[PDB]
A paper describes a structure:
In humans, the CALHM family encompasses six paralogs, some of which function as non-selective channels that are permeable to large substances such as ATP. We identified the three paralogs, CALHM2, 4 and 6, to be highly expressed in this organ. The CALHM subunits thus constitute unique modular building blocks that assemble with different stoichiometries into large membrane channels. In contrast to previously described CALHM structures, where the oligomeric state of individual channels was described as uniform, our data show heterogeneous populations with CALHM4 and CALHM6 assembling as decameric and undecameric channels with similar abundance and CALHM2 as predominantly undecameric proteins with a smaller population of dodecamers.
In each case, we found a heterogeneous, about equal distribution of particles with two distinct oligomeric states. In each structure, the subunits are arranged around a central axis of symmetry that defines the ion-conduction path. In the plane of the membrane, the dimensions of decameric and undecameric CALHM4 channels amount to 110 Å and 120 Å respectively. The diameter at both entrances of the pore measures about 52 Å and 60 Å for decameric and undecameric assemblies respectively, thus defining the properties of an unusually large channel, which could be permeable to molecular substrates. This density is observed with similar properties in decameric and undecameric proteins in both datasets of CALHM4 obtained in either absence or presence of Ca2+. Collectively, our data are compatible with the presence of a lipid bilayer located within the pore region of CALHM4 channels, which could interfere with the diffusion of charged substances.
Numbering used by the authors:
A (entry chain D), B (entry chain E), C (entry chain F), D (entry chain G), E (entry chain H), F (entry chain I), ...: 4 to 83, 94 to 280
Write the structure that this text describes.
């Protein structure tokens, strides 16, 4: 009874998407907890933030796109009427699967926010504080970029540090919620538009998806079996018996040329 | 039902590649934690870094290439039209499998970064620090190369030490992210180019892969069975019965020459 | 289903080689942890190092070579055209199996390095240290060879001790990596050369290996069964019945000479 | 399926030899840890060392030789052409089995070395030490033989004690490695010589071993069954029925003489 | 499958002998640890040692001899040509089984040695000690026999006590090793002599042992079954039915004399 | 398969005797540990010792004799040629079983010895001690009998107490070993004499024992079944049906006299 | 297979008697530990001892006698030649079963002795003690009866208390051993006398016991089944069908008198 429930969940898109999201959340948490430390350098902080904020998104997005077998076939159809719209719908479905990873990564990393504070710990507009009046500009940059990582200064400095940190965390979390709401509204309007521009009815679509999936599977199985049978026939012509046999009473010794013959694969 | 799922995962490339990457991560972590210590010598530091940074990459890459059985056959075809392009595609697929190990090793070792700081702990451009003004050049080299391993000096020295360490860790992690992004973009463009220059359709390719795999397997099985039968026939001609038999009622004692005859293997 | 997977792994060379390497690593670790202590004598240190460094390599190599049954048969063919090349290929395959143990022993013992420091704790070139200027030569040897095992001297002495130890550990680990890289490149070029000089195709080789293995096994089984049947016939001629029988209704009492007759084995 | 794997390992010489070696290692460790203490007497130390070093070797060697059933038969053939060489090969194989125990005992006891220091704690050549100049010869013997077991003297005495102990441990371990290497090289050259002087081919030898083993087993079984049947017939002649019977309808009461008749065993 | 392995081990002499030795070692250890304390009397010490040293040997030896069923039969043959030599061989085999217990008891008790020191704590030749010069002879006996059990005297006394104890332990262990080596060499030469003087071949001996064992077993079973059948027939003659029966339709009431008749056993 | 091994051990005398001995050892230990305390009275100590030393022996011996069913039958044969000797052999075998308990009780209680010291704590010959010179005789008895249980006196008194205790423990243990050796030698000589004076051969004896045992068992079973059948027939004559029946279609109501008839048992 | 071993043990008298004895020991221990405290009154102590010493014996004896079903039948035979002797033997066997409980209770309670000291803590003959000279008689009774339970007086009083307690415990244990030995000798002589005066042989007795037991059991079963059948027939006559039936096709409604008829049981 196992394989029944296995296939049932494997078809169920909700479970697969939820598992992907959970995996990305856990991986992000472990990653951030292990190998993250703000540089607290002079001008090389914003890059160290932006990298961790963005690059994983691009990587996971490209990976989630390119790993889908159907996308390669669609590109091959495209690379050097109704077929165009159907290709667009196919591509859109694969996109709807693949987008789940980068958006959830961005969401969790903005909500925890510990990345963003390092990303923009230098842009804090300081104009209404007593300790930043007389000090030099470069001295201000130095004392400003050192805030996130450590603290050893007097009380007022660590208090203004706490204040800047809270402000930046607020900004990060608001930006995260904005990203979530915009992503959701865009996904909804896009799915509705795709359902609108579809040339098929509410029933031909399901038939079509089943057609595609079962086509791929059956053709794979058939090609495998056919090539196996043909290679088996060549083997039997060479040695004199079918390999899957038993108690064979006839054996043909090969000639010093038959090896040369079987060398080519006939493609 | 076991062997079904075993073969299913064994065909699945994603699981194999993920397992390889996890194994390399764990092995690298154990290795670095056990047998690594910066030399803190005068000029013999950069080599001690570069070795651990590079040599495992070359070793694992050559091992992941040479261990693939098909690569030896392709080289034999090459060593002393359509066949050339097909060989190129075969070689490219094996490469796509083998490259996973060295790149993940480099990635994890640069991201942890503890190797790179030892690799280039001497190249730190020191020009704007108060304790490196009057001191001699060789004295500067000595005091500079001692930073990574230990600390016993006054406060200002350990502070400039912490600063150099943070700078170098930042450089290492940025270099790592650059390596990852370049590797990914190169892999993607290369796979797309390979799919472009392919002379086969979206269906002949799958048939072709199944052809290759099943060809290898079936020919192995057939050759084994055929040689077994032939050796069995020689044995029965010598001793007078088939070995796989039971309740044999006839035995032929060998002559002092038959041993000389069976000595040769007929190749 | 057990014996299926047992035979599958038993044919798989990768698993066997990996198990051998793991066993050697564990054994080396236990050995070194239990029965190793630097002599700290005057001139009898280098030998105590070199023994543990080398002798296990020779022992394990000779054991891994001589224990392979096929190597004895090949030597018998050699000891007092195509057969020569085939013998060379057979010997090379057995070598490829046997070399795994000594090289991994050397690798792990050099990487841990605790052997090498005792091996060459006397050759340290001391010329730029303040405490080795006025002291006598033999006094220098005495104070130099005592470094690895214990420490009771003032601070400067234990510091120069730590420095010599770090230098020697660095040298050991670099030598180990050099050994690994040279061994790998040599193994690769040698395997490629062997595949080049081979007179057989990519298919005759597999057939040939299966031929050898099944030949050995079947001949063993057949010889056993044949000798069993012949001895059974002699027994039945003597006592008057086949031993594997039941409810025998005839018994022949032996004569005082029949014992003398059955005494010889007929070889 | 149990008895299959049991017989498979029972034929496998490697596993049996490895188990013997492990058993001897464990037994030696327990023995030494429990019942060993240096006498620290005047002239009765060297014997107490040599006994534990040697006598177990002789005992285990004689036991491993005499316990092999085939060795008794070979001696009976010897005790009051081709047969001589075959006997030599048989004896050599049994020797190759039996030698594993004493050599591993010597190896482990020399490598731990705690025996050797007690064995030769009196022969230490003391000529360059300040506390052994004026003291009398017998006083020197007394103070020298007391080193291994206990320590209560001032610092310089316990330091020279530590030094003598380290020297002697070094000597013991080197002697052990020498014994191992010489034993291995001798075993290898001897096995090669035996394979050289053998009059049989690479195939007759296996047939011969199977002949010997199956001969012994089958003759044992047949003799047992035959004697059982004969005794059963005598019993049935006496009492009037076969013992292995059931529902016997005839009983013969013995006479006061039949007991006298059955008294003799007919040999 | 249980009874197969049970009989296999039960025939295997090595396992039985090893179990006997282990049992004697454990029993001796428990015994000595529980109920042993040196008397420290004047002249009644040597006996208290010798008893524990010897008497268990005699007891275990006589028990291991007399408990073997075959020894009683051999004595009955002896008590009031070839038969003599065969009896000698039978007796020798039983001896080879029985001797294992006393010799291992002596060995373990001498090696631990705690018995011997109490056995001869009075014979210590004291001539070169300062505290035994002026003291009276009986006073010397008193102070000498008190050494093993307790200590309350000044330092020099307890030191000479420790020295005497170490000397005596050395003597005990050497005596033990001598006993082991002499026992082994005697056993070997005796077994070889027995194999020499044997009138039978290398094959008649095994047949003979199987003859003896199966003879005993079968005769026991047959006698049991025959007497059971005869008693069953007498019962059926008396009561009128076979006891092992069911649904018997005829019953014979006994007479007041039939009880008198069945009273005798007919021997 | 259970009942097979149960009967096998139940016939095995060695296991039964060993279990009896172990049970007696454990019971004696628990008994002595729980309910033993020396009276330390004036003249009532020796009895309190002798009771625990002896009375359990007599009780266990009489119990082990009288509980054997065969002993009652032999006495009945005796109570108001060959039969006499056979009765003697039967009685001797039962004795050999029964003697194991009292002798092991005596052995363990003498070896622990804590009973004997209380048994003869008053007979200690005191003539060479300083504190027993002037004191009165009855005062000496009082101070002597108080030794075993408690101690509150000055040092010299408790020392002479320890000395008397050690002497008495030595005497107890020697007496125990003497009892063991004499018991063993007597048992051996008695068994040999019994085997000597036996009128039967080495085979008639086993037949005879099997005869006795199976006779008893079969007669018991037969008598039971016969009486059951007869009572069943009487029941069926009374009520009109066999009780072990089912679906009986005929019932006989008893008369007011039939109850009077069935009242007698017919013996 | 369970019920076989259950019946085997249930017939075995030894196991039943041993279980009864163990149960009485445990129960006595729990009882004494829970609800016992000496009254330490003036004249009401001896009764409080004697009750716990005796009354349980009488209770358990009467219970063990009256609970045996056969004893009631024998009394009925007795209550208002050979039969007399047989009744005596039956009664004697039941007595031999029943006596085990009271005697073991008395034995364990005397051996622990804590009851007897309270029983006779007032009868201690005090004539040779210094503190009982001048004191009044009733004062002596008061101070004497307070000994067992508590202690608060000066040292000499608690010492004479300890002495009286030890004396009384000695007396209790001796009395217990006397009771055991007399009980055993009486049981033995009585059983022998019963075996002597028996009119039956060594075989008629076993037949007789089996007769009695199987008679009781079979008659019980038969009476049960017969009464069940008769009541079933009456039921079927009333209602019109056999109750143990199914699918009955005929039902007889009862009349208002049939209930009056079935009211009587016919005895």
């Amino acid at each position: 009874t196992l394989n029944n429930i296995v296939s049932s969940l494997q078809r169920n898109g909700i479970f697969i998407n939820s598992l992907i999201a959970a995996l990305t959340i856990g991986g992000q948490q472990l990653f951030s907890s292990s190998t993250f430390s703000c540089p607290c350098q002079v001008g090389k902080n914003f890059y160290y933030g932006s990298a961790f904020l963005v690059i994983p998104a691009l990587i996971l997005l490209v990976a989630g796109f390119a790993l889908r077998s159907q996308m390669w076939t669609i590109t091959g159809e495209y690379c050097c009427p109704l077929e165009c719209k159907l290709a667009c719908l196919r591509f859109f479905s694969i996109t709807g699967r693949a987008v789940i990873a980068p958006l959830t990564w961005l969401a969790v990393t903005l909500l925890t926010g510990t990345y963003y504070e390092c990303a923009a710990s230098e842009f804090a507009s300081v104009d209404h504080y007593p300790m930043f009046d007389n000090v030099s500009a470069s001295k201000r940059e130095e004392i400003l970029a050192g805030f996130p990582c450590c603290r050893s200064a007097p009380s007022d400095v660590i208090l203004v540090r706490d204040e800047i940190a809270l402000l930046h965390r607020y900004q990060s979390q608001m930006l995260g919620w904005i990203l979530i709401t915009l992503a959701t509204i865009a996904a909804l309007v896009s799915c509705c538009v795709a359902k609108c521009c579809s040339p098929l009815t509410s029933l031909q679509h399901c038939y079509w998806t089943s057609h595609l999936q079962n086509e791929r599977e059956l053709f794979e199985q058939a090609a495998e079996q056919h090539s196996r049978l043909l290679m088996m026939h060549r083997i039997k012509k060479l040695f004199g018996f079918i390999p899957g046999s038993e108690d064979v009473k006839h054996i043909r010794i090969p000639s010093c040329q038959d090896w040369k013959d079987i060398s080519v694969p006939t493609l």
